[PDB]
Amino acid sequence: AAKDVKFGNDARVKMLRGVNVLADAVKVTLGPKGRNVVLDKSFGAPTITKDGVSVAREIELEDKFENMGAQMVKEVASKANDAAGDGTTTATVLAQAIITEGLKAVAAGMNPMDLKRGIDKAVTAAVEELKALSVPCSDSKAIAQVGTISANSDETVGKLIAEAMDKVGKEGVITVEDGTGLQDELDVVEGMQFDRGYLSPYFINKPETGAVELESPFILLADKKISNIREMLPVLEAVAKAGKPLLIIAEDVEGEALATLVVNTMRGIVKVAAVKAPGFGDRRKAMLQDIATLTGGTVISEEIGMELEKATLEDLGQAKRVVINKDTTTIIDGVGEEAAIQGRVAQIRQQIEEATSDYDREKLQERVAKLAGGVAVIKVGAATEVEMKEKKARVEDALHATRAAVEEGVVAGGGVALIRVASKLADLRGQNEDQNVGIKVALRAMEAPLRQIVLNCGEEPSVVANTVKGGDGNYGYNAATEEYGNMIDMGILDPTKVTRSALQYAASVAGLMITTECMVTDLP
């Protein structure tokens, strides 16, 4: 009902102090010599963690305006983590630096619009410089190296990732799953992955990764929107009597159907997951047909008179494993005739020759490559099961890091890339002097994360940052060994995508907060 409103400097200082609390909580964990943050748990055993993700997720300030500021910075940091795969702490500390300096400038009387424009100009220049400075990661040796560093110096993990990407390609779909035995088994199976997520997070079976993982499930491919249930209840009865989980891939399943599916899933009487149909228009129908051919089943379409009432087990697609993340889903080893797959890829290639528009042509290349390439599975082997779990988690993290490195490149890790780019961009200027002030704010902000890492290491940050700026290339300061040298030589590297995303999202949130003249929140 009644709401509190803050205008001008009061709202901005509220946001600044909230962001300060969040960044002070998170940034202490940054760096190889990170600090420990105790997250008190109501169950009884407090947890000690050194990752900024958990600390950021667990923070919620009591004051309303402080809470809003901290939560919005946390939201943009989580966006950076979801996109790049890492760099939440770097994004948070960069955002804190930009916000502090920009608010100090605004309080002097600087124009927020020009400050934001200068900050964005500096950030775009920094992204271009990072792209220029990035070391390409295309050789299998470089892939193995990125795998090793991304997995705490494990040659086996890097070798597995490198050979998996060799078999599936740089852009191929590669997934990791638990495997029996001690040795690591790598196999390739016929499957596909389309960028669609679960309609509700209530279907999640693995809270560790938030992935709806299904083993040997049935998939129901519907060409029509589903709102009611009574037309499709026999499908639920059939999958229940079959005893195996069911996957729903329709144009959209929402309303009472989604509600009853979520309720049943929480009840546990039946385990059924629903994911939206990829694409739209005729493309959606084409890829639904592609998935139907992959799974050996058929799609139910209202236009051809095939109702959901007649949908039974014989016309129900079946797979081996299904992994549904927040944004992407993966069907693995869908059982189906190889002749059908060959016919489908041949027909799509034909359509490629008699395609005319470039957009349709590139979409057809994407579809045929995705369908024909398949998905390889890497099975983690270890002596003890807990070791298998930790190794599989490390393999997943290393796979994400390697994928990011392939997508963008590899730069110097430990914040050296950002400070090097900031030193390189010392002479950039904008139209207004306010834009120059904003550019200087951005430069100091990109200098900040290395200073924080050095401060966590215990060394003084000023002289170390000055020495790193004095050098050129990937030369910087190693926090672990307290020595200088080339980061790629020392192996301290991060994907260019991670650094670029952290910088971009910190810039976005800083621009949003600097240009905020009013806050509205519920009354305490």
Side-chain angles (χ1 to χ4, degrees):
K3 293 180 174 67
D4 199 331
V5 289
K6 289 290 189 50
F7 305 103
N9 205 75
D10 308 328
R12 288 198 289 265
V13 300
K14 277 288 174 180
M15 284 157 103
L16 176 61
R17 92 179 312 282
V19 177
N20 279 335
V21 166
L22 160 65
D24 288 7
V26 169
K27 81 191 173 180
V28 291
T29 70
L30 189 61
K33 300 188 183 302
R35 290 320 154 80
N36 298 90
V37 167
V38 290
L39 300 171
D40 287 337
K41 165 168 293 300
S42 304
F43 273 9
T47 184
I48 297 89
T49 60
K50 309 165 67 76
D51 51 348
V53 184
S54 292
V55 188
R57 190 165 61 245
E58 287 288 325
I59 190 75
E60 172 203 46
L61 270 63
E62 64 273 19
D63 195 0
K64 290 298 182 280
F65 308 94
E66 293 181 76
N67 176 71
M68 305 178 24
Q71 283 301 109
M72 65 180 288
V73 171
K74 142 174 167 57
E75 283 177 4
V76 310
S78 57
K79 260 287 307 180
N81 181 88
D82 296 0
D86 201 359
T88 304
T89 311
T90 62
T92 304
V93 67
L94 280 156
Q96 181 206 11
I98 313 179
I99 285 155
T100 47
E101 281 304 90
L103 271 295
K104 188 269 183 182
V106 163
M110 295 296 172
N111 186 256
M113 275 318 120
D114 301 330
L115 266 289
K116 177 186 176 177
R117 291 199 58 165
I119 288 168
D120 299 299
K121 178 183 182 174
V123 163
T124 51
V127 163
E128 284 301 322
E129 292 296 327
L130 275 167
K131 186 180 289 293
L133 186 139
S134 64
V135 168
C137 189
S138 177
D139 192 1
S140 174
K141 181 69 176 177
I143 300 305
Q145 200 67 26
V146 176
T148 50
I149 294 89
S150 47
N152 290 317
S153 300
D154 287 359
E155 180 269 353
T156 302
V157 175
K159 179 34 65 193
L160 294 174
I161 293 178
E163 60 192 349
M165 292 180 183
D166 294 327
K167 293 182 183 293
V168 302
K170 314 278 289 178
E171 292 88 350
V173 176
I174 181 63
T175 183
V176 57
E177 57 164 335
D178 69 86
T180 183
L182 183 63
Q183 295 298 109
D184 278 293
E185 189 182 5
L186 188 153
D187 289 321
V188 59
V189 295
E190 294 294 328
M192 61 79 71
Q193 163 190 102
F194 58 96
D195 298 70
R196 280 301 182 185
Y198 43 77
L199 280 85
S200 173
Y202 282 69
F203 301 78
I204 290 185
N205 279 13
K206 305 297 187 292
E208 161 184 343
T209 51
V212 193
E213 190 276 331
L214 281 75
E215 300 185 358
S216 165
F218 284 132
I219 62 170
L220 171 63
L221 296 172
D223 192 74
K224 74 163 293 190
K225 301 175 73 70
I226 302 185
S227 284
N228 54 2
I229 302 97
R230 62 192 69 188
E231 82 281 15
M232 61 79 71
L233 190 142
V235 176
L236 265 292
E237 299 298 326
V239 298
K241 67 182 290 294
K244 290 198 307 315
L246 172 67
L247 174 57
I248 287 172
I249 308 188
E251 204 284 332
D252 210 331
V253 178
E254 80 292 331
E256 63 160 51
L258 187 153
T260 190
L261 288 168
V262 163
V263 159
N264 284 125
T265 291
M266 294 296 172
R267 295 292 186 271
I269 189 66
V270 73
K271 174 69 205 192
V272 173
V275 65
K276 219 183 177 175
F280 63 99
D282 53 353
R283 293 162 294 273
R284 167 182 64 93
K285 307 183 191 299
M287 325 194 275
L288 270 293
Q289 185 59 41
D290 295 359
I291 299 173
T293 54
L294 188 140
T295 189
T298 184
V299 59
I300 312 299
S301 198
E302 53 89 21
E303 53 184 355
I304 58 176
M306 295 298 102
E307 69 272 14
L308 288 190
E309 190 277 331
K310 65 92 177 179
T312 61
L313 295 173
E314 51 270 13
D315 287 330
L316 203 53
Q318 184 176 342
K320 177 60 180 68
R321 274 190 62 246
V322 173
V323 177
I324 305 183
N325 289 15
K326 171 184 175 63
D327 49 0
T328 183
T329 183
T330 306
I331 295 90
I332 302 175
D333 194 13
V335 55
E337 296 90 2
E338 183 65 26
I341 309 302
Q342 296 302 108
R344 288 295 296 163
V345 298
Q347 186 293 336
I348 298 304
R349 294 183 189 276
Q350 293 299 109
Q351 287 183 176
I352 279 159
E353 292 84 4
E354 65 268 12
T356 73
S357 45
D358 288 330
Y359 182 76
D360 288 332
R361 271 201 289 267
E362 64 188 359
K363 290 217 79 165
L364 287 177
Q365 274 79 243
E366 180 195 25
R367 271 158 43 81
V368 68
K370 175 179 69 175
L371 192 152
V375 178
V377 288
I378 54 175
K379 294 220 175 66
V380 187
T384 61
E385 309 303 326
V386 57
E387 277 177 342
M388 183 278 288
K389 308 310 285 155
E390 67 182 1
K391 190 176 182 66
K392 181 266 290 181
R394 283 213 318 264
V395 160
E396 168 182 354
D397 190 17
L399 189 59
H400 282 106
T402 316
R403 182 74 65 83
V406 171
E407 283 168 357
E408 271 277 348
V410 161
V411 294
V416 176
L418 279 169
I419 191 165
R420 184 55 42 77
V421 171
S423 60
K424 191 62 62 67
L425 279 167
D427 55 357
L428 190 65
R429 271 91 171 95
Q431 305 299 112
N432 201 337
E433 59 87 18
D434 294 333
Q435 295 197 4
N436 303 2
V437 171
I439 285 174
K440 289 317 163 186
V441 171
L443 298 188
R444 295 183 182 94
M446 306 166 263
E447 292 188 14
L450 176 67
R451 293 186 164 161
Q452 175 61 215
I453 292 171
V454 171
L455 194 142
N456 280 4
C457 183
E459 291 277 343
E460 48 84 23
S462 309
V463 176
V464 175
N466 185 80
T467 318
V468 169
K469 285 171 76 180
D472 47 330
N474 290 334
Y475 169 83
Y477 171 75
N478 180 351
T481 65
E482 304 184 350
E483 286 292 329
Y484 293 97
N486 188 280
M487 295 296 172
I488 307 301
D489 292 336
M490 294 182 286
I492 299 175
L493 57 87
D494 56 337
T496 315
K497 194 181 193 304
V498 172
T499 300
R500 179 187 59 76
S501 295
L503 179 63
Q504 282 285 144
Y505 283 113
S508 288
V509 65
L512 292 191
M513 282 190 24
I514 285 180
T515 66
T516 300
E517 293 83 3
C518 180
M519 293 177 71
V520 181
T521 193
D522 48 326
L523 210 62

